[model samples]
Target: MQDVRVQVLPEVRGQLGGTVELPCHLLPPVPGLYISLVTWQRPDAPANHQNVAAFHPKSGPSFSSPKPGSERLSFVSAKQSTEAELQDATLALHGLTVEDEGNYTCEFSTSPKGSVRGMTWLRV
Candidate 1:
């Protein structure tokens, strides 16, 4: 077992109506770690800390809020191995707006290692 922590950028700045990819992944990589869930949330602003998106092996991907522009948010992941195909929890937000400026969090729930999360800020 290795100390695999969730890693993310400090900040990602994007122009209005553009796109930004907020990176999030496990450091050093963990072989044979099965990821059961991937989720994203807003840590600041909007008061409620709303959930943005989620991914599950069975249910696939879903958006928490049906806000007018919620379609712009999506997860961009890559295959790692047969044991851990969904290691990357990177969130790609297209059609950016000033209201999108805030802190965003990414979390992963896995087998054996439990759960870990990391956060990044988006500047417009």
Candidate 2:
């Protein structure tokens, strides 16, 4: 069996109302290994202050505009394929706000390897 790991890209700085993209990727390319789950968490605040904005896979890749809890927080999946796209396993945030500034993580799981985590930091 292979070990699981998490990777986070460099922090991106953006102004409020602008769009930012969080890039993520998985390694080893296990066949038949589908992205069973994906989640986004805010890690710059207190334990109880941490907010989970988006969760995918079982909840599907579709998202609602003006996301719950935070109106400025939004998630979007551009394309999903086994290609050399920089935005494959990515999340796009539109009309970014100060509340959206923080460390975000992408949690993924597969049928074979179980789970892995990735993260990105956003600054305003």
Candidate 3:
């Protein structure tokens, strides 16, 4: 089986009450596969064990999780509507708090190969 490759920053710093952007990419790109879904998770964040934001090619992006910082979470690749541009699954966090200081995960789910994810730490 082939492994899905993903890339993310090792660490990032965000100011309290300010906004920060988190980056994610599907490395090398798959020729025939299209991203079925994109999700961002913060398992270690207080009151935020669920997905922060999710994106779908058919329905676009949604912040469906009811977490502490879910409302302030949005996709940096918001304007893209095609599979090519949607490959960048970067996310943005607004109104950052101490509780938001933790690990952030970016996951790309695709057909045939399952899901691939990478983590990045946030410092306050």
Q: TM-score of each candidate?
A: 0.84, 0.66, 0.83
- Steric clash pairs (candidate 2): none
Clashes of each: 0, 0, 0
RMSD of each: 2.9, 4.9, 2.6
lDDT tens digits, residue span 1-124, model 3:
3556899999989899998889898877667776788888787654545667888887888775565345787777744455335678888888888877878788988877878899999898
> What C-alpha root-mean-square deviation, in Å, does candidate 2 show against the real structure?
4.9
For lDDT, candidate 2 versus 3, the one ahead is 3
Per-residue lDDT of 1-124 in model 1, one digit per residue for the tens?
7866898998998889998888988766777677888778886546443778777776677777653135787767743333335677787889888888887888888887888888888898
**Residues 1-124, model 2: lDDT tens digits:** 4555555687877777887777666665545565656666666666544645544444444433234244444445533343212224567667877876778777776667777787778887
Question: Ten consecutive residues with minimal summed lDDT in candidate 3?
Answer: 77-86
Candidate order (lDDT): 3, 1, 2
- Evaluated with TM-score, which candidate comes out highest? 1
lDDT (Cα) of model 2:
0.60
Q: State the displacement of the C-alpha of residue 117, model 3, in Å, after optimal TM-score superposition.
A: 0.5
